[PDB]
Scaffold this active site. Structure first.
Site, PDB file in Angstrom:
ATOM      1  N   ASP A 100     -19.244 -24.891 -47.576  1.00  0.00           N
ATOM      2  CA  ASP A 100     -19.335 -23.807 -48.654  1.00  0.00           C
ATOM      3  C   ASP A 100     -20.781 -23.065 -48.386  1.00  0.00           C
ATOM      4  O   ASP A 100     -20.727 -21.827 -48.245  1.00  0.00           O
ATOM      5  CB  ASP A 100     -19.298 -24.335 -50.015  1.00  0.00           C
ATOM      6  CG  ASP A 100     -19.329 -23.235 -51.136  1.00  0.00           C
ATOM      7  OD1 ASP A 100     -20.295 -22.777 -51.388  1.00  0.00           O
ATOM      8  OD2 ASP A 100     -18.317 -22.929 -51.489  1.00  0.00           O
ATOM      9  N   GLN A 154     -18.859 -29.031 -50.068  1.00  0.00           N
ATOM     10  CA  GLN A 154     -20.169 -28.123 -50.535  1.00  0.00           C
ATOM     11  C   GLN A 154     -20.955 -27.912 -49.134  1.00  0.00           C
ATOM     12  O   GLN A 154     -21.787 -26.847 -49.467  1.00  0.00           O
ATOM     13  CB  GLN A 154     -20.799 -29.195 -51.651  1.00  0.00           C
ATOM     14  CG  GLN A 154     -21.711 -28.171 -52.300  1.00  0.00           C
ATOM     15  CD  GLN A 154     -22.654 -29.076 -53.186  1.00  0.00           C
ATOM     16  OE1 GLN A 154     -22.866 -30.429 -52.824  1.00  0.00           O
ATOM     17  NE2 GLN A 154     -23.261 -28.661 -54.125  1.00  0.00           N
ATOM     18  N   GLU A 201     -30.147 -28.903 -54.756  1.00  0.00           N
ATOM     19  CA  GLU A 201     -29.552 -28.928 -56.010  1.00  0.00           C
ATOM     20  C   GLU A 201     -29.070 -30.192 -56.817  1.00  0.00           C
ATOM     21  O   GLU A 201     -29.137 -30.382 -58.036  1.00  0.00           O
ATOM     22  CB  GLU A 201     -28.408 -27.932 -55.893  1.00  0.00           C
ATOM     23  CG  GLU A 201     -27.506 -27.746 -57.092  1.00  0.00           C
ATOM     24  CD  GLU A 201     -26.370 -28.624 -57.209  1.00  0.00           C
ATOM     25  OE1 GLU A 201     -25.910 -29.306 -56.600  1.00  0.00           O
ATOM     26  OE2 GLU A 201     -25.874 -28.735 -58.479  1.00  0.00           O
ATOM     27  N   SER A 220     -25.766 -22.898 -40.476  1.00  0.00           N
ATOM     28  CA  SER A 220     -26.857 -21.975 -40.846  1.00  0.00           C
ATOM     29  C   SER A 220     -27.628 -22.593 -41.971  1.00  0.00           C
ATOM     30  O   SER A 220     -28.727 -22.486 -42.252  1.00  0.00           O
ATOM     31  CB  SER A 220     -26.199 -20.632 -41.139  1.00  0.00           C
ATOM     32  OG  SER A 220     -25.285 -20.793 -41.976  1.00  0.00           O
ATOM     33  N   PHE A 275     -20.230 -17.373 -40.184  1.00  0.00           N
ATOM     34  CA  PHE A 275     -19.654 -18.061 -39.018  1.00  0.00           C
ATOM     35  C   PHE A 275     -19.929 -19.809 -39.448  1.00  0.00           C
ATOM     36  O   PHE A 275     -21.049 -19.972 -39.700  1.00  0.00           O
ATOM     37  CB  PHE A 275     -20.051 -17.832 -37.799  1.00  0.00           C
ATOM     38  CG  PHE A 275     -20.038 -16.343 -37.580  1.00  0.00           C
ATOM     39  CD1 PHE A 275     -21.268 -15.615 -37.771  1.00  0.00           C
ATOM     40  CD2 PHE A 275     -18.944 -15.495 -37.083  1.00  0.00           C
ATOM     41  CE1 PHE A 275     -21.196 -14.155 -37.702  1.00  0.00           C
ATOM     42  CE2 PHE A 275     -19.020 -14.170 -36.799  1.00  0.00           C
ATOM     43  CZ  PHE A 275     -20.142 -13.524 -37.148  1.00  0.00           C
ATOM     44  N   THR A 293     -24.830 -16.708 -43.147  1.00  0.00           N
ATOM     45  CA  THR A 293     -23.984 -16.202 -42.001  1.00  0.00           C
ATOM     46  C   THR A 293     -22.419 -16.526 -42.481  1.00  0.00           C
ATOM     47  O   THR A 293     -22.198 -17.600 -42.812  1.00  0.00           O
ATOM     48  CB  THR A 293     -24.462 -16.768 -40.715  1.00  0.00           C
ATOM     49  OG1 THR A 293     -23.990 -18.116 -40.799  1.00  0.00           O
ATOM     50  CG2 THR A 293     -25.762 -16.417 -40.606  1.00  0.00           C
ATOM     51  N   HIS A 340     -15.562 -27.861 -57.607  1.00  0.00           N
ATOM     52  CA  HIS A 340     -16.177 -28.214 -58.584  1.00  0.00           C
ATOM     53  C   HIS A 340     -15.419 -29.046 -59.624  1.00  0.00           C
ATOM     54  O   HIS A 340     -15.903 -30.171 -60.201  1.00  0.00           O
ATOM     55  CB  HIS A 340     -16.616 -27.068 -59.422  1.00  0.00           C
ATOM     56  CG  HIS A 340     -17.611 -26.153 -58.914  1.00  0.00           C
ATOM     57  ND1 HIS A 340     -17.900 -24.849 -59.524  1.00  0.00           N
ATOM     58  CD2 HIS A 340     -18.398 -26.359 -58.021  1.00  0.00           C
ATOM     59  CE1 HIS A 340     -18.964 -24.440 -58.741  1.00  0.00           C
ATOM     60  NE2 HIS A 340     -19.337 -25.197 -57.851  1.00  0.00           N
ATOM     61  N   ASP A 362     -21.598 -22.139 -38.652  1.00  0.00           N
ATOM     62  CA  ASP A 362     -22.525 -22.442 -37.615  1.00  0.00           C
ATOM     63  C   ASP A 362     -23.855 -23.095 -37.907  1.00  0.00           C
ATOM     64  O   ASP A 362     -24.868 -23.287 -37.019  1.00  0.00           O
ATOM     65  CB  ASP A 362     -23.003 -21.010 -36.881  1.00  0.00           C
ATOM     66  CG  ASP A 362     -23.768 -20.035 -38.249  1.00  0.00           C
ATOM     67  OD1 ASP A 362     -23.547 -20.693 -39.188  1.00  0.00           O
ATOM     68  OD2 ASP A 362     -24.056 -18.938 -38.108  1.00  0.00           O
ATOM     69  N   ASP A 402     -22.452 -23.274 -46.054  1.00  0.00           N
ATOM     70  CA  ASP A 402     -22.840 -22.750 -44.493  1.00  0.00           C
ATOM     71  C   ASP A 402     -22.102 -21.181 -44.523  1.00  0.00           C
ATOM     72  O   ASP A 402     -22.524 -20.538 -43.803  1.00  0.00           O
ATOM     73  CB  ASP A 402     -21.909 -23.468 -43.660  1.00  0.00           C
ATOM     74  CG  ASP A 402     -22.335 -23.522 -42.222  1.00  0.00           C
ATOM     75  OD1 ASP A 402     -22.429 -22.159 -41.599  1.00  0.00           O
ATOM     76  OD2 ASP A 402     -22.514 -24.415 -41.670  1.00  0.00           O
TER      77      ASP A 402
END
Ligand code: HEM
Ligand SMILES: *[C@@H]1O[C@H](CO)[C@@H](O[C@@H]2O[C@H](CO)[C@@H](O[C@H]3O[C@H](CO)[C@@H](O)[C@H](O)[C@@H]3O)[C@H](O)[C@H]2NC(C)=O)[C@H](O)[C@H]1NC(C)=O
Ligand SMILES: *[C@@H]1O[C@H](CO)[C@@H](O[C@@H]2O[C@H](CO)[C@@H](O[C@H]3O[C@H](CO)[C@@H](O)[C@H](O)[C@@H]3O)[C@H](O)[C@H]2NC(C)=O)[C@H](O)[C@H]1NC(C)=O
Ligand SMILES: *[C@@H]1O[C@H](CO)[C@@H](O[C@@H]2O[C@H](CO)[C@@H](O)[C@H](O)[C@H]2NC(C)=O)[C@H](O)[C@H]1NC(C)=O
Ligand SMILES: *[C@@H]1O[C@H](CO)[C@@H](O[C@@H]2O[C@H](CO)[C@@H](O)[C@H](O)[C@H]2NC(C)=O)[C@H](O)[C@H]1NC(C)=O
Ligand SMILES: [Ca+2]
Ligand SMILES: [F-]
Ligand SMILES: [F-]
Ligand SMILES: [F-]
EC number: 1.11.1.7
Length: 595
Positions: A108, A105, A258, A190, A186, A184, A351, A188, A110
């Site tokens: 995912d 997750q 979440e 993010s 990649f 993004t 999931h 990384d 990212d």
């Protein structure tokens, strides 16, 4: 003629050029084509979109138009008939920790995000859709079938808004509708640092030159940090216990809060940054706030990549690992790093790995308190449980000692995610992730199961018996067929996940192919991939190969006993060793001699 141009609504700046640090938005990675992999661009299309009216309407919209001569089944009826189950006993994956599910997750989040359409910072559409189920513009309701219990207690439908789409906003035409990726492409981290300048800045502690990320100033976890709270009011995390009033957390990715166990991972990551930041400052007293920020950030992104590719992928793909992702051979600028539209549905396999309860354990890994184990459904947008009920440690131990749900054809998605989901906008814990996952396939205009099977060079079943062999399940194949009439219509999500699991893996042939493809692509196409010569020195690389998710826990919580291999199932006392036996990251190669 390609229409090549549409590079409108998207953030753009100059390429720092020759700079040794990733840009926040993901721009400037590919030198010759700077916008590849950048946030706020369209999901790539490996195959042409398939819409009802060819251009933008999903299949199911016009209640009289068929897909291949047949009516597509209501998303929720596919849920009721195929995806649901009642007995949680027997379901756990016997050789995968609950961290296995959790890491997927993270990765995912990212890589991809297709946000919903807004158009109403106040509007009667975010209420005409939920209150009357009238289909229209971006409101594409999930109608309830005759006989669904939810009819009796909830209404006529579960509201659902179509996903965002490139070029403009407003009512749009010309080309086939393409969804946006606000994140993004990649690996990384993010999800830790943001995709947007702005947001990226907000996240930083810039009150001091230590290059640290911002931390909550109102609550603390045994002197260890928590993520900041969010400005946002209203707040769902607040709406979950009007008495407690603990807002959601603020992280690089909006979906962070979440569920409780995801917020946990997010906060272990933030912690790793600050820890890295300080250490770096010690070895190199003369480095910058920015310098500290980027350097830790670079070490962190290297981390998320190593665990994903060395520890997590080998076990999702299994034996099919070698076939799609051959050993690293250097950065290839011609390889397209963009996350494809189908991947965002292929990666939703996880999931089916989410179990129904979450545990908190005391120091010897025993049930922490009288209400240790909880139903996953009270944990959606639940932040008060961390802040006011033990913090992080009790919750991380759970990830290392419990198991994930194992995909099973007769048991697919726990009712916690299937009937009781809390959507951040509306009020109840009465949504269905499986029906949504199915409805979302149609919104994104996905080709059918066989189109993808064909895409991966695998047989394409056309009759009941054919589908029976591919799925190696007689009954499942019958239900699928009774709802779809033809395999050509089977939605990719339910189709890819219904296949039997490859040897040593945790997804079937079709999914191993689509994921396997995506990962090789986002690794071979990344100028900043950690092994790419010239990004980290040889001695720095040697240092990074010792990273383990186990050590991450040692250095960032007060847990003193942990497994060596953290994704496999581990029994406590026996599989748990003292932190001292776990390899540490030697940050000494990051030293900088002036004279
Ligand atoms: C049990 C915790 C989880 C919850 C409650 C949850 C919930 C959701 C929801 C509500 C969505 C968006 C639905 C929509 O509007 O289309 C979503 C998307 C998604 N979920 Fe999960 N999810 C969970 C766990 C996981 C895991 C463990 C994985 C994978 C390992 C996963 C993978 C994905 C993927 C790939 C998306 C699409 C992302 C995008 O392109 O926007 N989820 N999830
Ligand atoms: C529970 O999961 C474990 C991981 O899937 C698994 O053990 C792993 O088995 C694989 C395949 O036999 C081996 O993989 C590694 O083999 C050599 C060392 O033997 C390494 O140098 C390679 O890097 C390669 O990845 C390992 O022996 C082992 N993996 C690890 C990291 O220890 C068990 O099979 C599973 N338990 C059961 C009962 O099946
Ligand atoms: C809403 O959030 C509340 C906390 O933010 C939470 O209340 C807290 O939870 C239990 C009671 O339900 C209490 O725990 C125990 O506290 C003392 C020990 O210090 C014991 O002597 C008590 O018997 C009690 O069991 C918390 O202290 C309590 N705090 C308050 C103000 O009630 C609620 O449980 C949450 N409820 C919902 C709607 O989710
Ligand atoms: C940003 O700057 C400093 C970084 O250390 C933080 O201030 C320290 O935090 C605690 C708060 O209880 C105290 O020991 C002192 O007030 C501060 N010590 C120092 C180093 O001066 C501050 O928390 C940070 N702000 C944010 C939101 O990150
Ligand atoms: C870089 O990746 C691209 C992407 O597949 C590859 O380009 C191929 O180059 C081969 C020659 O070996 C051609 O026969 C293929 O048709 C090309 N495909 C595409 C999509 O361009 C190639 O594998 C890599 N380039 C090199 C030489 O490193
Ligand atoms: Ca990313
Ligand atoms: F427990
Ligand atoms: F509830
Ligand atoms: F130690």
């Amino acid at each position: 003629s390609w229409e090549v141009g549409c590079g409108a609504p998207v953030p753009l700046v100059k390429c720092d050029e020759n700079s040794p640090y990733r840009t926040i938005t993901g721009d400037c990675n590919n030198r010759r084509s700077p916008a590849l992999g950048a946030a706020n661009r369209a999901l790539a299309r490996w195959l042409p979109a398939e819409y009802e009216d060819g251009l933008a309407l999903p299949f199911g919209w016009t209640q009289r138009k068929t897909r291949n001569g047949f009516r597509v089944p209501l998303a929720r009826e596919v849920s009721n008939k195929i995806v649901g189950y009642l007995d949680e006993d027997g379901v756990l994956d016997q050789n995968r920790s609950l961290l296995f599910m959790q890491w997927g997750q993270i990765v995912d989040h990212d890589l991809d995000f297709a946000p919903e359409t807004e158009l109403g910072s106040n509007e009667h559409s975010k209420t005409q859709c939920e209150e009357y189920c009238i289909q229209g513009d971006n409101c594409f309701p999930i109608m309830f079938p005759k006989n669904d219990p939810k009819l009796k207690t909830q209404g006529k439908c579960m509201p659902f808004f179509r996903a965002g789409f490139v070029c403009p906003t407003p009512p749009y035409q010309s080309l086939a509708r393409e969804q946006i990726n606000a994140v993004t492409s990649f690996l990384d981290a993010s999800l830790v640092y943001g995709s947007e300048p702005s947001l990226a800045s907000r996240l930083q502690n810039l009150s001091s030159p230590l290059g640290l990320m911002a931390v909550n100033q109102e609550a603390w976890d045994h002197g260890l940090a928590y993520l900041p709270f969010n400005n946002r009011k209203p707040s769902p995390c607040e709406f979950i216990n009007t008495t407690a009033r603990v807002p959601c957390f603020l992280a690089g990715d909006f979906r962070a809060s979440e569920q409780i166990l995801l917020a946990t991972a997010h906060t272990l990551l933030l912690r790793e940054h600050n820890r890295l930041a300080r250490e770096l400052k010690k070895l190199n007293p003369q480095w910058d706030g920015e310098k500290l920020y980027q350097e830790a950030r670079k070490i962190l992104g290297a981390f998320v990549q190593i665990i994903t590719f060395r520890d997590y992928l080998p076990i999702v793909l299994g034996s099919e690992m070698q076939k799609w992702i051959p050993p690293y051979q250097g950065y290839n600028n011609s390889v397209d790093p963009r996350i494809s539209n189908v991947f965002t549905f292929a990666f939703r396999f996880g999931h089916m790995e989410v179990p129904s309860t979450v545990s908190r354990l005391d120091e010897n890994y025993q049930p922490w308190g009288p209400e240790a184990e909880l139903p996953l459904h009270t944990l959606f947008f639940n932040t008060w449980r961390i802040i006011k009920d033990g913090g992080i440690d009790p919750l991380v131990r759970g990830l290392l000692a419990k198991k994930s749900k194992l995909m099973n054809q007769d048991k697919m998605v726990t009712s916690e995610l299937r009937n009781k989901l809390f959507q951040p906008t509306h009020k109840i814990h009465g949504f269905d992730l499986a029906a949504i996952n199915l409805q979302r396939c149609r919104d994104h205009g996905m080709p059918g199961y066989n189109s993808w099977r064909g895409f991966c060079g695998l047989s394409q079943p056309k009759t009941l018996k054919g589908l029976q062999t591919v799925l190696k399940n007689k009954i499942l194949a019958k239900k699928l067929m009774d709802l779809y009439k033809t395999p050509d219509n089977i939605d990719i999500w339910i189709g890819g996940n219904a296949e039997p699991m490859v040897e040593r893996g945790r997804v079937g042939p079709l999914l191993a192919c689509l994921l396997g493809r995506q990962f090789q692509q986002i690794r071979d196409g990344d100028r900043f991939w950690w092994e790419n010569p010239g990004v980290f020195t040889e001695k720095q690389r040697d240092s990074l190969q010792k990273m383990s998710f186990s050590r991450l826990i040692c250095d960032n919580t007060h847990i003193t006993k942990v497994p060596l291999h953290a994704f496999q199932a581990n029994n406590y006392p026996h599989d748990f060793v003292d932190c001292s036996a776990v390899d540490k990251l030697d940050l000494s190669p990051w030293a900088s001699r002036e004279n």
